[PDB]
Amino acid sequence: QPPMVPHSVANYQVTKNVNQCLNCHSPENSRLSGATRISPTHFMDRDGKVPRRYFCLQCHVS
Numbered sequence: 417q418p419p420m421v422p423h424s425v426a427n428y429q430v431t432k433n434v435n436q437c438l439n440c441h442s443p444e445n446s447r448l449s450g451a452t453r454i455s456p457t458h459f460m461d462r463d464g465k466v467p468r469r470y471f472c473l474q475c476h477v478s
């Protein structure tokens with residue numbers, strides 16, 4: 417299983433044009449927020465070529 421989310425997810429929307437999880441977990445915000453960056457596994461295509469893993473709460477549970 418993917419790691420559980422150790423914090424609440426109640427305030428964060430994820431829809432076609434909005435992904436509030438990335439305000440902290442994106443590559444550009446991870447250092448500043450303390451949140452672990454989403455890894456290249458979340459960006460790669462089917463063959464490994466380098467997010468495609470976008471709808472975060474389909475996989476991660478809080």
Ligand code: HEC
Nearest residue numbers: 419420421422425428436437439440449450451452472476
């Ligand atoms: C900043 C205000 C955050 C927002 C927005 C989201 N997350 Fe977060 N998350 C944050 C911190 C400071 C941490 C703890 C440090 C760490 O990264 O461990 C986390 C942790 C997670 C994890 C655990 C990663 C791990 O260490 O194995 C997951 C899977 C995670 N967060 C997911 C997640 C999702 C799906 C969000 C939106 C619904 C989300 N986070 C928002 C800070 C912040």
Ligand code: HEC
Nearest residue numbers: 417418419437441452453454455457469470471472474475
């Ligand atoms: C299922 C297809 C997933 C979706 C959608 C997202 N994540 Fe994920 N995440 C998944 C797995 C199986 C793992 C384990 C290790 C791996 O990288 O493959 C993870 C891990 C994370 C972590 C830890 C650091 C990392 O390994 O990338 C974080 C912080 C995390 N996931 C965050 C996260 C966010 C914010 C997502 C939406 C933008 C997201 N994941 C989607 C599986 C899946």
